[PDB]
């Protein structure tokens, strides 16, 4: 198919922020992984 008209400026941004919003959930996992690793008590994750 082909688009009839072009997407506007703000409708574009709303779709980009959703793609960027995935970084919010990836950062929480990293912070949870660091604090769960700076204690030297986890025997299931070897970081070296």
């Amino acid at each position: 198919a082909v688009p009839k008209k072009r997407t506007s400026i703000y409708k574009k941004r709303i779709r980009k922020n959703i793609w960027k919003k995935k970084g919010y959930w990836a950062a929480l996992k990293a912070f949870s992984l660091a604090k769960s690793l700076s204690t030297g008590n986890s025997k299931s994750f070897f970081v070296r």
């Binding site: 025997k43 299931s44 994750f45 070897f46 970081v47």
Partner: protein
Amino acid sequence: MKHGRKIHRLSRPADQRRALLRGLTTQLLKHGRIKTTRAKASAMRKYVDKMITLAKEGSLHKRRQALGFIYEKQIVHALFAEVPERYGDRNGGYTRIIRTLPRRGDNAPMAYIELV
């Protein structure tokens, strides 16, 4: 849907699954510790415990199976020599998996696997 299907596909056909897992056991049993993905490590527990189960009943019929499975010849002869003294009391669970950061190229979740 895969209801009732317990099998690790690893994105490979059967000829490559039967060779890939068969080849990693050759390296683990001689090195004792390797670095692989988590999907490959999870599928590895079924086969490593099988070969170790053959050593407990270290007969001649049980040895020929390992020779057909294990590629190299010297490890199988060396495997039956040490396992009865090393695992003369354990019943299953002959290995553990330690997680690890992923790779740089493809973000594949990596993890170590070793023999207890």
